[PDB]
Design a protein around this ligand. Sequence first.
Ligand SMILES: CCN(CC)C1CCN(Cc2cc(C#CCNC(=O)OC(C)(C)C)cc(I)c2O)CC1
Ligand SMILES: [Zn+2]
Length: 196
Amino acid sequence: SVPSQKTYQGSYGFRLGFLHSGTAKSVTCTYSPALNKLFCQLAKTCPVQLWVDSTPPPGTRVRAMAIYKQSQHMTEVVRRCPHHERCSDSDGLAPPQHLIRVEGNLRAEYLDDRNTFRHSVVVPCEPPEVGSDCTTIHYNYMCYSSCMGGMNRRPILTIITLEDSSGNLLGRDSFEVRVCACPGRDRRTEEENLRK
Ligand SMILES: CCN(CC)C1CCN(Cc2cc(C#CCNC(=O)OC(C)(C)C)cc(I)c2O)CC1
Ligand SMILES: [Zn+2]
């Protein structure tokens, strides 16, 4: 089955936010509002902001999952390729098969769904640091979009869900992801193609 990608703010007014990192050739992570698409280098830090209009209950959690964007691939589980799943680059917490990791959160949990077999990573929802207006999660993407035997050049979507302590839906947002060597150039290219 295919998880929903329907944007849903819910009772707490949940939505994502992204930094404005620009498109210099050196940039390692950059987000295109026009394309709703994050472009990032392999295994580099991707800051994703969580915004709400009101405080969700204690025990609320935030889950990330990847799916293929194209209709003809949506039913296939997104996973790391046969090379990267074996490169012994685990942080001690993430299963080496998982495309999406959360960086620097000891409370991150990794799920292999017993029915859909899809992978996800989930952390507790927490208020912002004192002085900040939103909470930031740092994600890593552990294969290139081009990885043979894995994503193999197929575009993916990351779906971020706000959940209660039982796993019930409270909110949902999503964005496309390309993991590539030069995110700055690729974002410039794709934005120009869109303008045409
Ligand atoms: C209009 C928006 N604005 C106006 C001033 C508020 C700014 C202050 N925020 C607080 C806030 C809490 C959370 C949380 C949580 C889990 N419950 C949890 O930790 O519960 C407590 C704190 C009760 C223990 C996540 C986020 I992202 C977040 O912004 C809410 C919005
Ligand atoms: Zn790979």
